[PDB]
């Protein structure tokens, strides 16, 4: 209706982690997708992709990772590595008969594609695909919808939690894993357009930004702060999140980098703004950058 | 007295995740300090101390970093265990240390029966003879208690209890593996001076009658170091055998107490694989699987 895509794929990654440490080489350990039929307004739970992934840098899930993701060790020990699962994911898109640029991924934040996908792609030496360099940040739309329908003071602490509390949606909790997030985001997505929300690609991944031209003011305790760690991630990772305002997105933007205006098969090969300033102190090295081979 | 002229105080530190005992512990620091027995002198100038790069879990958990005091950057630029182990062997040869004429001293069975065994499995290196006999200093300390006299101890660790007993200040230089070595060395010296019979009291053996029956499985073993120990005992090929003070003799070096074979033949393969523990795909033993015990 108010969406230029006939199909929306609610995407969700879960990764390895150690809550107390942000200097961590997060590897994908679960890959979950559920399809949403936009014209017919139907969450297609029968149309889904849901695979575990075996990590290779940290092969034993920490206890806090298991508690957070709900993923047992046995499930990843018997899983394929990301390169195999990603290949199965690409075939899945073909099997569904999806065309390039006529569908878009939906996430509850930038984290899934800007950070998790981008970093995992580096580990696996896979080129960042064009359909991961444009997507729908649902929480960003939720922000706009909130000013429009009047704000509330929400008690929830997470993006999905806040959105469910705002629309008074019961928290979906069956599998207690990635697929549950997918289902919650999908239901939120559905309720949002039914409340009259306008859902479209609102974030793009580009190769360059002017705000990265000056060195980051280094915070020594960044490893204990998800917020400050984000600033580090922004400089290390080659592609940056670029907001695109409502009404400005065209389908023909797929798959051309908004900045350099070149195909995403050429753009994204090399880091255009390597943060050398962060890579010169060997008494305080960035572990996740070092092990991924950024320096 | 002690039949060895040189005692080497050994300490291993590993990757870990405290809340989970089903963890494939890898050596990340390798520390040794020498003790000259005839001269009763701790030789800090004679030491081996190197970091080791793990490969199964390359990022130290925060709780491992806090316990071991090892920073991530120190293992990132370190060599793998097989390399460090080769450096260690060359270091022994350079000291002119003749095999069978020195012995390793540890504060417990953990360093050699558990940590060394498992690491050797991962590295695919045969367990050496000088790691299959050693001195468990805590077991000597415990065995000598009635002679030394009773004393209430509030410490919870072996090193802590032994320091507290002898009113020794806790050595805390670098807060790492080497501090354990220095503490154990200092305790060892004190114990010897107080008349303790310091000699080999634990031997690693290929078979044990108490592994003939399958272990009764405790489903919650992963959250308990004690319960997990029972699992380790079955999974690891070599068993701790205890020998009382004054029964050990130097000629025992390099020969298994059970099969009587040389430790070049014995230790090639697990002789009592606990297949009973490996039947449930709904509850696999992760550290056993990833190591290739099944
Ligand atoms: Mg999520
Ligand atoms: Mg120790
Ligand atoms: Zn570009
Ligand atoms: Zn034997």
């Amino acid at each position: 209706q108010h969406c230029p895509f006939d199909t929306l794929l609610i995407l969700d990654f879960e990764t390895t982690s150690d809550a107390a440490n942000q200097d961590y080489p997060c590897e994908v350990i679960q890959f979950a997708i559920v399809a949403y039929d936009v014209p017919n307004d139907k969450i297609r739970e029968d149309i889904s992709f849901n695979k575990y992934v075996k990590p290779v840098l940290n092969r034993t899930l920490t206890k806090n990772c298991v508690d957070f993701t709900g993923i047992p060790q046995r499930s990843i020990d018997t899983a394929d590595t990301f390169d195999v699962v990603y290949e199965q994911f690409q075939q899945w898109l073909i099997t569904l008969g999806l065309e390039e640029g006529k569908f878009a991924f939906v996430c509850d934040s930038r984290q899934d594609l800007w950070r998790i996908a981008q970093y995992q792609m580096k580990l696996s030496n896979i080129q960042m695909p064009a359909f991961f360099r444009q997507y729908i940040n649902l929480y960003k739309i939720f922000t706009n919808e909130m000013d429009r329908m009047g704000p509330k003071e929400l008690s929830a602490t997470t993006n999905i939690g806040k959105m469910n509390e705002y629309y008074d949606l019961p928290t979906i909790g069956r599998a207690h894993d990635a697929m549950d997030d997918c289902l919650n985001i999908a239901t939120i997505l559905q309720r949002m357009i039914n409340m009259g929300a306008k859902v479209t690609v609102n974030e793009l991944l580009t190769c360059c930004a002017s705000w990265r031209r000056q060195p980051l003011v280094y915070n020594k305790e960044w490893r204990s702060s998800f917020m400050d760690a984000g600033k580090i991630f922004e400089r290390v990772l080659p592609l940056v999140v670029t907001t695109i305002r409502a009404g400005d997105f065209r389908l023909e933007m797929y798959g051309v980098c908004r900045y350099c205006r070149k195909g995403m098969d050429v753009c994204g090969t090399s880091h255009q703004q390597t943060p050398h300033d962060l890579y010169k102190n060997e008494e305080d090295p960035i572990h996740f950058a070092k092990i991924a081979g950024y320096y």
Side-chain angles (χ1 to χ4, degrees), chain A:
Chain A
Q1 184 182 136
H2 280 66
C3 179
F5 302 94
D6 275 32
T7 306
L8 295 175
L9 303 179
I10 296 85
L11 175 146
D12 182 277
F13 288 125
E14 301 299 326
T15 73
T16 55
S17 59
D18 186 32
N21 181 27
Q22 291 299 314
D23 197 352
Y24 196 92
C26 300
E27 298 172 280
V28 176
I29 54 176
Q30 189 169 10
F31 197 158
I33 302 173
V34 63
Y36 174 73
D37 187 311
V38 174
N40 301 102
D41 188 33
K42 181 60 181 176
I43 301 175
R44 300 295 304 275
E45 300 191 15
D46 54 327
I47 306 177
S48 53
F49 183 88
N50 190 9
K51 260 83 161 59
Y52 293 115
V53 182
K54 182 191 286 178
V56 298
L57 301 179
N58 293 285
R59 302 177 202 185
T60 313
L61 301 186
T62 67
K63 181 63 184 302
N64 60 92
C65 173
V66 172
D67 291 342
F68 178 73
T69 65
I71 302 173
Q73 185 63 45
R74 60 186 181 86
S75 285
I76 64 161
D77 283 354
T78 56
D80 293 291
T81 54
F82 180 81
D83 53 319
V84 178
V85 173
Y86 179 74
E87 175 57 31
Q88 293 170 334
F89 154 75
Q90 290 189 290
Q91 180 56 47
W92 182 70
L93 296 174
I94 297 179
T95 304
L96 290 180
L98 291 171
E99 299 186 276
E100 299 175 354
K102 290 191 179 179
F103 70 95
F105 290 97
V106 182
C107 304
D108 67 332
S109 69
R110 59 176 60 187
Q111 301 300 323
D112 290 270
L113 293 181
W114 157 74
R115 179 171 65 81
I116 295 176
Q118 220 189 147
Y119 187 79
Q120 181 62 70
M121 290 302 178
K122 180 67 176 64
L123 297 183
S124 306
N125 191 25
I126 304 178
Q127 184 176 231
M128 195 72 175
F131 48 73
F132 279 179
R133 290 186 57 169
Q134 62 166 220
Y135 60 91
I136 305 183
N137 189 330
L138 194 66
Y139 185 79
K140 182 180 177 184
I141 304 176
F142 170 70
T143 293
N144 298 338
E145 282 295 289
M146 205 154 182
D147 301 342
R148 160 180 174 270
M149 300 207 315
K152 294 196 200 178
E153 300 291 68
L154 304 178
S155 178
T157 177
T158 58
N159 283 16
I160 293 170
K162 282 175 181 180
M163 289 185 291
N164 272 338
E165 186 177 5
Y166 184 90
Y167 297 93
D168 198 340
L169 295 172
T171 294
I172 297 172
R174 312 115 129 275
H176 295 295
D177 60 11
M179 183 53 64
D180 284 15
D181 292 13
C182 285
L183 293 172
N184 277 291
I185 293 167
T187 305
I188 291 162
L189 172 63
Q190 184 177 48
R191 174 61 69 86
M192 277 177 63
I193 77 167
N194 296 348
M195 289 291 191
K198 194 145 206 169
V199 183
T200 324
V201 169
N202 53 8
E203 288 192 358
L204 312 166
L205 296 188
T206 61
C207 60
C208 181
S210 182
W211 56 265
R212 288 203 304 185
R213 294 184 74 251
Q214 62 162 296
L216 177 69
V217 177
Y218 189 70
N219 180 18
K220 258 121 170 55
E221 304 296 335
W222 69 265
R223 292 185 180 79
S224 61
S225 171
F226 183 83
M227 197 62 60
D228 295 280
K231 302 294 181 183
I232 292 291
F233 301 156
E234 283 169 357
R235 308 311 188 91
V236 173
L237 297 170
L239 302 182
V240 147
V241 171
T242 304
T243 271
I244 173 161
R245 301 152 60 85
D248 295 19
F249 174 77
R250 311 302 172 197
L251 266 61
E252 60 171 332
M253 288 167 35
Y254 182 103
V256 179
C257 171
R258 217 63 238 141
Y259 192 93
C260 67
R261 291 288 162 85
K262 291 194 291 186
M264 293 167 173
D265 43 24
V266 179
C267 169
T269 298
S270 172
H271 200 328
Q272 298 299 308
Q273 300 177 288
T274 306
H276 299 293
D277 53 281
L278 297 175
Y279 295 159
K280 60 182 179 182
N281 181 19
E282 212 58 38
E283 202 75 354
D284 189 30
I286 312 296
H287 169 64
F288 82 85
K290 202 73 171 183
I291 200 169
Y294 285 108
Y295 80 108

